[PDB]
Design a protein around this nucleic acid. Structure first.
Ligand SMILES: [Zn+2]
Lengths: 142, 108, 50, 121, 86
RNA sequence: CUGCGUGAGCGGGGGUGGAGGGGCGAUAUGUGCAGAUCUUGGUAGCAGUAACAAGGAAAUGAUUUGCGCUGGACGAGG
RNA sequence: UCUCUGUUCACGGGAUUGAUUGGCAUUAGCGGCGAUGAAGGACGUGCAGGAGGACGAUAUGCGUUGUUGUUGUGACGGUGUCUGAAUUGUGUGCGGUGUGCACGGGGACCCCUUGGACUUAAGCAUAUCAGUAAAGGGAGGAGAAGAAACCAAAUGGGAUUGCCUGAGUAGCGGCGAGUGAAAUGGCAUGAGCCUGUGUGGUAACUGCGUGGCGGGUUGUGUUUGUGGCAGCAGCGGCGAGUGCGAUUGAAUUCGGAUGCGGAGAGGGCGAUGUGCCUGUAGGCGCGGCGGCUUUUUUUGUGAGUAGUGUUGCUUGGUAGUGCAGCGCGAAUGCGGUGGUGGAUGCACCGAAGGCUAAAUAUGGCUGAUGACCGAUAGCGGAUAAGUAGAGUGAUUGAAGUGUGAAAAGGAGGAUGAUGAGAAAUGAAAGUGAAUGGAGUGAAUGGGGGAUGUUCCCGCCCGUCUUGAAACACGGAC
């Protein structure tokens, strides 16, 4: 019951697939982009997020801050970062939720089997960039 | 009231039904894909059969020719062939028709 | 009455342990505030029909 | 939490007596819940441990029978070892029984076999 | 006295719960359900146009028919153990 | 609040509001309300009116005293 | 003070403007239940749980495999209390005591049986509505039909099914109201076969079983596909290219730059978007499931039928167009048909046994679309809706969407805090408070003049009617 590769271009069907998909698809729609200096080691652009990653905010009142993710809520599209808070009417602090597509990944987390997820996708991309080169260079003759 | 032709519109039955296909352009091209898919499943053989030339019956259509159903067993025999073997070569055979004209027998 | 069949007794028991309000630990949550059960029955107004 | 892989090395009667031990510590957890003295994840994991031991026990009873009947055709297996397809897909003739012809009828077709030709233009 | 005063005599109950359909319409002196027709082997013809959409295929749980529909999309392969015999 | 038009109607100014809105030509219509003992929703007068209740008392009321007549069990129904 | 009437602020109610994980329509595919126990019903299952949803004593979920570190989830396999056809039964085949099959659910579309009345004829009985609705029995992804005992009148065509023309025509009809074909011509799709009389130098045949039993001379006659050819659906993964300045609570706005494009479809993000994310164009990988495809020499037949007298129904079929009951009941160089009853020429065909793709119909499910509706609309149903509730029962059946970008926070009052903003917008009917003017005249209107009035004119609208201000009817707002 995955829905993010729908053929339809109907507005009601697309908003329905964003707000009501399963939790597996909520994580891929919560994807972030890598920095320039981290995108020279791995070849790819965006990768999804988890706790422990270091990011940087871009736009809003926390524009320019940097911190570590302390909690994620995939179902509601909410990320909590250490250092972006507010004081309630009691003296206490609370963390503010941010939307995942306004962050940039720098120095992610590599401990619970995540070092291999990055290496599997780095191989699939360079294998796919050669099917395109062989086709292109031969279609160069085409 | 008035001077008009007397009307004869038959809509007195509640059981009557209306029928409309609202998109005949997509219905034609879905049937041309069916027709090209049979053709390359029979691939070497051409999906249509050879049919004879016949003559329209009455005095109104007397002077007109036409494609008919199939050849007869005598027309197949004189062309050097058996009608059981003409059917394996893409030729249609009709054993109901009778032979009564010598010019038409020769065109076929 | 005191006399009743076995099947009448087990449906009266099921109806009995249904007539209850939302528990307090669930109402105290952040995303369940302002919720009441609203499927409640009082023995004088509405009848169960056996 | 005991693994499904860990129980796949025991025998049929070793699993059956391992399932009787899980029944005992569920009986003790049921008494501590009456005292308001039970953890928040204790009864659930013991109850899921017993569902694992019962699915692995049916997998081993079914491997005894796949050896007892190695050659019997599908019609001659016990009715609870035959495939459950559909009532309608069970009532239908086979593909062999659909293209069969009488002996007199395919003698009339021997002299006129099939030909492969191609019409061009 | 055919109005208010006649209502105080209505304490006998003619029906009980039907064991096929679960309504209070199994008439005990008649031995017959007025909703579903039990104990006839077939179910009764519904009495109205709306009555057909209150109790049909899909208004309950469909515990088996859902499973069978997921199996017919994959060719009815069964338990992987028993597949050797077949 | 104010200008234009015989009229159906069309403009501008100051508050309020917090996200979209129009002109001109052809074209498609579920295209304009005061009434139908019209349909659904809300609200007046009547009117603080009709009707109903205010059960004998003793600063207190587990104590003292005055009045009424159904009282106690099994079944149906709850 | 009270009554009427200006002005400002506060109520009361939920119209209007703008939104929408809902509805509705057309189109392409599919049409997948059950004695191997279905659909439906009852009762149960969470450490702390009522409704809904989910689940079955393996119970708020278990196994394998993929993706994940998470309140985790996708694809497939297993389990499934007590009931219900509910059957430890009834009927029946093959055997000879073993082993099969049927029953119920659904029924839009299809086949067979039975069979109305409202209505039209300006009345009504034949007629019409209509062999239609309702009822019952039997099937499938379609079904039924089908290879001339045909059509015709030429120099003839050549199985079935659908569409256009023929044609509102030929005809039927209290010749009234009405009703109503076909052949030819033009297109779509195209396909033809099996049997009851098969050896006699030996049943050459097959259901069960491992060289045998059962059947059969009152007549059996049944090899073969992990191979090829064509197609259809699904799953997984890779997928190009960005930075400054001004306004803002926040920019996709405005102003300079710099790139991609077989990708400038659509959606989300604090607001109006080609380089912020998802996808998109386009390549790769992996299952699965079907259709075609193997041809020893054979000759000959269809009876309580066809027909027909009588009786009832039906059709445009007119003096049978077709069907049925009852009674009579055929032929073998012979039998049937040719829009008027019968005769005779000529023409054209072989009934009373069996099977057959494609082009056609259609609730629901899944994909894709739209000059469709926007909360009194659209499905009854944008929410714990066939629910809450009503009825002895068969049945019947609603009303209810919106704090904010963020909970950053309130909820007797007062004092305050947060926020861009106290927080969707907030019409009329009607009301309270203050303040200006008028009155003891039912009020309200037009002319002419004026910071209320003084002069003149003026009965309440709509409707039927010769005729309404009417003691004519409808109308509190
Ligand atoms: Zn019942």
């Amino acid at each position: 019951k995955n829905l993010r590769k729908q053929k339809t271009s109907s507005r009601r069907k697309q908003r329905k697939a964003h707000f009501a998909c399963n939790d597996g698809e909520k994580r891929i729609r919560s994807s972030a982009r890598l920095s320039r200096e981290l995108r020279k080691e791995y070849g790819f652009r965006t990768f999804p997020l988890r706790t422990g990653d270091t990011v940087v905010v871009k736009g809003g009142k926390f524009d320019g801050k940097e911190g570590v993710i302390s909690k994620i809520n995939y179902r509601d599209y909410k990320v909590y970062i250490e250092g972006c808070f507010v004081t309630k009417n009691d003296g206490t602090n609370a963390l503010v939720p941010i939307y995942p597509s306004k962050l940039t990944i720098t120095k992610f987390f590599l401990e619970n089997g995540r070092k291999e997820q990055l290496e599997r996708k780095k191989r699939a991309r360079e294998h796919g960039m050669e099917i395109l080169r062989k086709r292109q260079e031969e279609v160069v003759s085409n | 009231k008035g001077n008009h032709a007397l009307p004869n519109n038959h809509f007195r039955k509640t059981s009557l039904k209306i029928r409309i296909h609202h998109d005949p352009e997509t219905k034609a091209r879905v049937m041309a894909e069916k027709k090209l898919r049979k053709a390359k499943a029979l691939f070497p053989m051409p999906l249509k059969k050879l049919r004879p030339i016949v003559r329209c019956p009455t005095i109104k259509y007397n002077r007109n020719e036409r494609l008919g159903r199939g050849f007869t067993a005598a027309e197949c025999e004189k062309a050097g062939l058996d009608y059981r073997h003409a059917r394996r070569l893409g030729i249609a055979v009709d054993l109901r028709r009778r032979d009564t004209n010598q010019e038409a027998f020769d065109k076929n | 009455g005191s006399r009743k069949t076995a099947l009448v007794k087990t449906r009266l028991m099921r109806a009995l342990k249904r007539n209850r309000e939302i528990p307090a630990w669930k109402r105290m949550m952040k995303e369940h505030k302002g919720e009441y059960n609203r499927a409640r029955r009082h023995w004088r107004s509405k009848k169960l029909k056996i | 939490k005991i693994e499904a892989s860990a129980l796949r090395q025991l025998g049929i009667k070793q699993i059956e007596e391992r399932a009787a031990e899980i029944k005992a510590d569920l009986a003790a957890l049921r008494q501590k819940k009456n005292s308001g003295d039970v953890g928040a994840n204790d009864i659930k994991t013991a109850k899921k441990n017993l569902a694992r031991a019962l699915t692995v026990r049916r997998e081993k009873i079914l491997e005894e029978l796949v050896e007892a009947y190695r050659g019997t055709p599908v019609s001659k297996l016990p009715k609870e070892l035959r495939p459950k397809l559909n009532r309608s897909k069970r009532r239908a003739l086979t593909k062999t029984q659909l293209r069969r012809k009488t002996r007199r009828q395919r003698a009339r077709m021997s002299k006129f076999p099939r030909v492969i030709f191609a019409y061009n233009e | 006295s055919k109005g208010t005063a006649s209502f105080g005599k209505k304490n006998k109950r003619n029906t009980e719960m039907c064991r096929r359909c679960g309504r209070q319409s199994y008439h005990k002196q008649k031995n017959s359900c007025s909703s579903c027709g039990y104990p006839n082997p077939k179910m009764r013809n519904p009495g109205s146009i709306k009555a057909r959409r209150r109790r049909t295929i899909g208004t309950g749980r469909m515990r088996y028919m859902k499973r069978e529909l997921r199996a017919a999309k994959n060719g009815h392969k069964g338990d992987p153990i028993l597949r050797t015999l077949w």
